[model samples]
Target chain A: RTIVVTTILESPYVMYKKNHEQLEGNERYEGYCVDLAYEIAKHVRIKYKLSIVGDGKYGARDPETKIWNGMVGELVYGRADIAVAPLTITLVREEVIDFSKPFMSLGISIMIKKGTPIESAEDLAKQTEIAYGTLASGSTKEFFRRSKIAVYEKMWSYMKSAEPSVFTKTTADGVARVRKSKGKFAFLLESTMNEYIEQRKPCDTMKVGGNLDSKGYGVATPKGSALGNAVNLAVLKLNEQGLLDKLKNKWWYDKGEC
Target chain B: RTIVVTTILESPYVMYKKNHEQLEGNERYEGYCVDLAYEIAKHVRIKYKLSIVGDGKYGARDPETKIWNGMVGELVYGRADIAVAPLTITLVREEVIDFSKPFMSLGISIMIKKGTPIESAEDLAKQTEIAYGTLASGSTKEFFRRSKIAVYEKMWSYMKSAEPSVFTKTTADGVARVRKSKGKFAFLLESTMNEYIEQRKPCDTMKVGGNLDSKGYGVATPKGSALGNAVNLAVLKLNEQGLLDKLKNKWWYDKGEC
Candidate 1:
């Protein structure tokens, strides 16, 4: 059976190749993730169909219904064969779905204009003059909402309580807010996303300080899916042979504007 | 129920405290793993008994019968409640066990004389004058044996067929061989053990070059064990609170010489 690949449309990960919406199927897209999925499918000797997540969410469970949403839902409910995107491999996620070993490691990072006063998360947590936030439903926000550290707990309190709410519905919005805020807003995001924006035109952002916490992302499949094993091996193969880093550099920096 | 913690007697991880012959039960040992187990039991709010692995092995399977050995078998056979040690979280192992998020990250590193000419794995794989070896039954050797690269396959073939064998029965033996060989021998080991040795008296050893591959060690439990959830959270708790790094520093470097 041809696998249905459910992914998110994040820049440099999954995005439309330029045209007048004229391409069909896989030809319509080109990005780091599509390239990776292309390689994994070739290595596994299989066919796949790419589909962007319908809701534009990565995945999370609703508290009241306990139902999953995003690419996670697509797998949990059997709508897709695998999720190929920037999905974090977390404990709660592991219990519901299987993830390949982390293909990429990242940490919580901040987005700020060059020469912004912020140097670390601690500084952001301590100062109120510059407001910051995260994707409202993402793992990064979940870490703060569920954290035990006083610094994060402090930031969490500030973010959820601020008028108009500091949480954004999308990484694009949170980052755009920073680009326009002139140092009045800083967006907390994963280092991968923050670093990608740093090389793009305008080149107004900087990923300051080391990661606040570190973790990795994995290609996810349904629990016990046959696709899990070979795809995992394929990732290890790519990493050992140095293709993964090469792919990242091609997408993230080779397309450098600033 | 009191959990039975199965561990190995690696220095500074699990070892007999001075004059331990007179002590009873848990009091008989002291070290990093013991301390970790202690805190986990405390955080998990459960009683536990410490038991050293009968085979002095971390655990691996016999190729023919596929019967597991060491701490892994202890869990598989229901003789232990959990494995609280430096167990690498590998894919094959994950199929049969559960692991917490990595509390510590490490890589396959080399142990060498302080002024050794070697700077990377590529350096060793290309030369043969200075013979190198790995623990006969460890994940480190398994990596080479199961490797996809031409370099590692070369090393693997050389190791398995060398006169007198390039494998040692234990880490200490491999390290000891490196110590007295006067740079004629290098030992392939995990970064943790290499760093720990660099701090001990004689201080003649050095951990050189970047790791060949990066992975992490996790506390493991038998699949579907009752202890899995809280223990995983406890590790995250300890790591986020910075206790894990403190424990590492305490055992690996606090007692350094030279």
Candidate 2:
């Protein structure tokens, strides 16, 4: 009895099977999230299969079509037993699926070249010299839209009216814009991804502020599933034993530079 | 006559009297905290003189001597009118001095090099690869020493036994250790300083996982000072007018990299 775990091929989290066209099961996986998933399975004593969502995007619901994509779709439709891989825990995602206690916590922040003038999220909100944008269909954009705080609300107002608008398609694309733009533009993404990019060569880009809000990465399960409780407890146990750190180090650090 | 206000040089907060020897009154001082003190004085309709404390330390009672240093001592022995740095509003501090309504909110966190393997504070608590330490006389250090939570208690156990121990003399030294080390040490300091450092060039560090606890910064007045109410009201008014954010951004982000 194998549980199907839905994930994506994002570097430092999940990567591709070099021979994906010919491989199956365990052979088809390798990456930080995949390694974490394997560890979770080992702790839970469950045989699991890695099911890559056809669409590469993380979870998001289409405003017009009322459809879901990537991992969110997989969890909502019972295509997978667990939704994992830097899949942010958002209010929308939590509605249709149950998420385990966040294995990791993050906030929306900007990525800049190493010596950028920006210093805090408040700085980003107050100025226009250092233009800022967030990943489209991601928590960063949503944070601004949903924020009730005065500064972030004001920032959202500014973003909505800016000429080109301030949003990008993904974390990688956002980092690319910052790296290429001479520190004029910063890409906003989860702090984890921001830190990961800061470590990569050129090493020019760095996360330039504290997280804007508090949210976490969780082991998501289909709504009301019995497996959710067990998975959550297993994740907590790993957290207690400090195994999560061991796994993150094994995948992101010891494994080195993805 | 200008009322004298004294403070220490804590980055993004207070700094030295760079031109004090040549200039008189306000010309000798500058910093986010300094500007904030000026704003408070203006709001309260008071003229003030600024002075720099020789000791670059926050107010804490020395266990052996029982005398305070820096601003804490300034307020206790009647050398200054108020302590307006990012002083934590703790019960212990409250006993000796009355704090205004929180001018800012912050927490405790670990600053690690960009590629460090650790994931959470809990992980650092269990391992030898990553060494953990905190400011010698701060709430963050006290958290590990007095926390009732299992993880913190365990962290305390490991820290008590670690080689060279897990105590740091000050936040500056803690951050310095992180910069000099090969990603093997983490310095636990106030979250505000951590965020401030994240924006600096050669940004080799980041505050990871999540904050250990939440607390607020207050204007610490002598226990029965007449200015306490005025300062509290000024902070509230500033908070209402969105001035606090402006001040925080000015210091935390606009100040040149140290």
Candidate 3:
């Protein structure tokens, strides 16, 4: 049986190719996750169809209805059989779906312009000279909002109330703000994505300081799906054979401009 | 009896003050660790004298003689009552000494000259365009030597065989090499030290990439020493009180030039 695979259109992870207009079906897009899904399908002997989540948000639950949204919702509602994007594994999401062991690891990181005085989250928290924010409705934003750590809690209070709203609608929007802010703004996102952007042209932006928290991205399947075990084993096999590392290098470093 | 505290003269951690000629005892030096030692002594109500490690090394065991050296040796041989420095706590060291819960945390980081094409260790390892080194005899160097991970192990093979030796005697020397090599050399050191250096004058260097490994600096004492419990409790108290964060701000960022 063909599995329905859901993913988000996050750059370098899943996005349309330059010649996407001439392509058909899965050939219309390519990225880190696209390659990952292709490899896993070969290993598990399953045919799969890749589709983007109807809503772009990574995943979150509605407080009033207690319903999952975005890619998570697609899985919980049985619209997709598996999620193969940079979807972070969280306690709330795990309750409604099962995730294969993490295929990639990451953490929230600080991104700064070339001359930004900020070196850490504490550095940003202690002063008003620089402004910082995360992608709106993203895990990074929620992380700071719900963090119990003293520094993060303090940062959340500031970010939630900052004038003009520091949050951006997308990662690209956040990156643009940082670049044009003249060293006055910082963008916080996952370290893996931050590092990928740092290698691109006009490399004025850099990931500074260690990650604020540690987490990982996993392949998600509907609760009790038989594909969970096979997907987990496939990921482990790829990890053990070093294919994940090779893929990361191929996408993030080999074509790096700076 | 007064505790004999051994530390190393690493810049920004422990350094001889400019007025050392006119000062005596603990007043003769200053830096992050010096202040830490003072705070711990005050909280634990212990009399102590801060002395520099005679060998000027972090710590290592001789292969043939199985003898410990540097701060580790001072504790192993019972020559010092405690050690408070940027001394990394490792499994090998833990086997011989008791350590307070970490007072500070850090990890191995990559340092690159501004404009260098390298964004990750794999980037450097894949090309001959750049040379990278770690402070010889330091935990960062030892980490690459012992890592079992494929990328790190691959890096180790290349670094270990590189001509002219990819190792330096001190962090300062390593930074100097990075500065003078234009964009051809990189330095690997503790993240704390790398961030500190990135803010200093000339400011032509920056820390790139996430930390390679995670560890912490602890107040180490002779195994089963009476002072161990008091020291451990004192460190935890300071951490809970936010004193450690305050101290870091005072030393690393308060006077940053860039």
Candidate 4:
């Protein structure tokens, strides 16, 4: 059976081709994870098919229904054999599935208009002159909501209570907010995207302050799947071989505008 | 049952207390990992005895004997129940043992005199004016030796054949050489140590260049050990709670010299 690799359509990770309507199957999609999936399949010698997670979400549990949603749900329910997207390696998600060692590392970072007074999370928390928030229904938001760290906890309180809601529906929306807010709004996002944005044109926004946490995106599979060990080893091998670094440069900087 | 925890003697991670000679057992040593062990043990509720790994090595297989040595060997051979040290989470090491999700993230980075003309690894690779190397018999050296990336491959070629031997027996030796070589020498090391040294006295040295590769340190256990999952989850808990970052500040910056 061709292995089913689940992923999400999120910017440079997995995006539809310009002529997507003229194509079908994997040919309709292209991007970093597409390249990653191709590389990993070669190393592991697997014939595979790429499919997007049905809900178009990364993955998290439903608090009231207790069912997982997103790419994680696909693996947990055995609908897909593996997840080869920017799915985060997180504690709660890990309980139900296995993750290869991180394929890419990032942390929640602040993207601000140039010359914003903020220098750290503390600066965001201590002042109301500049407002900050994260992408809704994502790990960045969860980080603040679940954080016990004093500064993050404080920021979470302010975000949950802010006038007109500080959270944005998408990463693109958040970046646009930072660009248009004219220094009055800062967006909390994964450093990977923040850095990618920093390099793109209209580079009026820049990542400022130290990252709020350290984490990575891992290729994931259901717990105890035979493929888990092989995929995990394959990722580390790619990292050591420098293929992971090469792919990042190809996707993030290869098209740099600024 | 009291668990045996293996670790190494590395400054700020594990080091002798001022009056170590007068004490016995774990009390004789103290540092960031020492505190980490204490916190982890409480969360997991296992009584653990911290013991230094003999041979003072983190871990690598003996080429001729095919025997794992250092902290990893202790885990593989069941000499210790766990390794609560700053042991790196690498591909080779992970094959033989299990690791908690990273407690700390770091990458191979460059260290040079503050005024050195070098700004990136590419700069170092293109020049013959400055010399550089990594800790002998460790992952840093192995990274260069095994890298397939063009720049890294070139660096490995130079490092392997450089006269007067750029390799150092210890990280401190590498750092000291950079200090005394008057900008003629540079050191390649994990960002953790480079940042630590940057904050130290004789602060004439600073870190430069983007990290060569991203990786992390994890608490380790024998593969299939019952403690693996618990320990891994606990690490994520601590990271989310900010205990890991707090501990870093306590050890690396509380007494900052620069």
lDDT of 3 by residue, B1-258 (tens): 788999999878899999999999999999999999998899889899999999887778999999999999999997898999988866577667866656777778999989999899889778887998787777777778877787788888888888788888888899999999989898888999998998899989999989875566888999777777577667756754567888888888997888
Candidate DockQ values, in order, are: 0.18, 0.02, 0.02, 0.60
* TM-scores of all candidate predictions against the true structure: 0.80, 0.52, 0.54, 0.89
| lDDT, candidate 4, B1-258, per-residue tens | 999999988878999999999999889989999999988898888998999988888999988999999999999998999999878788899899988878998999999988889999999999988999888888888888887779989999999999889999987899899999989999999999988999999889899978888888989999889888788878877877778989999888996699
lDDT of 4 by residue, A80-102 (tens): 99899988788888889988888
Q: Tell me the tens digit of each residue's lDDT in model 3 across A120-163.
A: 98998999889888888867787887777889899899898998
- 1 or 3, greater by TM-score: 1
Regions more than 4 Å wrong, model 2? A17-23, A64-67, A163-165, A255-258, B1-258
Clash pairs, model 4 backbone: none
Distance from true location, Cα of A79 in model 2, Å: 1.6
Q: Is candidate 1 or candidate 3 better by lDDT?
A: 1
lDDT of 1 by residue, A1-258 (tens): 878999999988988988918989988999999999999999889999999899998889999999999999999999999999999877678778877767888889988977789898899988998989999888899889888788989999999899777888887888888888888888899999998998986888889998888888899999768777677778766765668888999999888997
Single out the weakest 10-residue window by summed lDDT for candidate 2 chain B. Answer: B233-242
Residue B254 displacement (Å), model 4: 0.7
Docking class of 2: incorrect
Give me the overall lDDT of model 4: 0.88
Off by over 4 Å in 3: A1-258
